[PDB]
A = this chain, B = another copy of it.
């Protein structure tokens, strides 16, 4: 179980300020919910040598910390201590409903960002819910009211390949082998390629971006706390985005 590799103390040290009065998700994101969710995803934080398992947990908590960050440059303990500050997308101006024979939008329900990966759109809530065994198409706000389901949605995203994207899991553990195509595109194994899978269309292949800097700051601080090296290729600044 990953509970040996990441203790309650280490988890609370990494996510130091998530329960500060200013954070809307205060009290929601629990160590027990993270550990219970990880059990549902064999291989998560249990793949590779100890250093690689810690890099995987740091990378998962890093990327999710970015998606939910309340950080700012002069934040107490730095901006990479303010992961998991929010739960629901701020001021959504869409239902995130998209034409689909397979994933009909449920009446009165919205598919705005929820939980540690800010899961969005009926066509993501559908296959995610199917995968974890919950009807998230018809009960989307479970991602913001059930903290085990919340973490499961983010682990579903992390562990699930989506052609032509490999899984973040396979990238960070070194299971993923770049294609000749990938190598020409500058898509090399490491933390950078997890950013590319998450939001490469907007964030990768356009040089320095404060968003990608933020994803890296979290990953580095968590690796520092775990006492493991970052590995290589942390940015995607020269990576062509993975396809959709």
Residues 215-241 (chain A) with a chain B CB within 8 angstroms = 237-238, 240-241
Of all chain B residues, the one with the shortest Cβ separation from A89 is B101
Residues 73-111 (chain A) with a chain B CB within 8 angstroms = 92-101, 104-105, 107
Q: Is the CB of A121 within 8 A of B207?
A: no
Stretch at the interface among A15-23, A144-152, A198-206: A198-206
Q: Is the CB of A99 within 8 A of B94?
A: no
Q: Is the CB of A98 within 8 A of B201?
A: yes
Copies of this protein in the complex: 2
Inter-chain CA distance A98–B109, complex, in Å, is: 13
Determine if A72 is an interface residue (Cβ-Cβ < 8 Å). Answer: no
- Known contacts A98-B107, A107-B98, A202-B207; A181 and B93 CB within 8 A of each other: yes
A30 nearest CB across to chain B (Å): 29
Residues 181-220 (chain A) with a chain B CB within 8 angstroms = 181, 199-202, 204-208
Chain B hits for A157, CB < 8 A: none
Q: Is the CB of B98 within 8 A of A202?
A: yes
Inter-chain CA distance A199–B237, complex, in Å, is: 12
A187 nearest CB across to chain B (Å): 12
Inter-chain CA distance A97–B107, complex, in Å, is: 12
Q: Is the CB of B99 within 8 A of A121?
A: yes
Chain B hits for A100, CB < 8 A: 107
Q: Is the CB of A95 within 8 A of B243?
A: yes
Chain B hits for A202, CB < 8 A: 98, 123, 205-207, 238
Residues 9-64 (chain A) with a chain B CB within 8 angstroms = none
Q: Is the CB of A243 within 8 A of B94?
A: yes
Q: Is the CB of B164 within 8 A of A244?
A: no
Q: Which residues does A use to contact B, with CB under 8 Å?
A: 92-101, 104-105, 107, 120-121, 123, 164, 181, 199-202, 204-208, 237-238, 240-244
28 pairs of residues in contact across A and B, judged by CB atoms under 8 Å? A92-B243, A93-B164, A93-B181, A94-B101, A94-B242, A94-B243, A95-B243, A96-B201, A96-B243, A96-B244, A98-B105, A98-B202, A99-B120, A99-B121, A100-B107, A121-B201, A123-B201, A201-B206, A201-B207, A201-B238, A202-B205, A202-B207, A204-B207, A205-B207, A206-B238, A206-B241, A207-B241, A208-B241
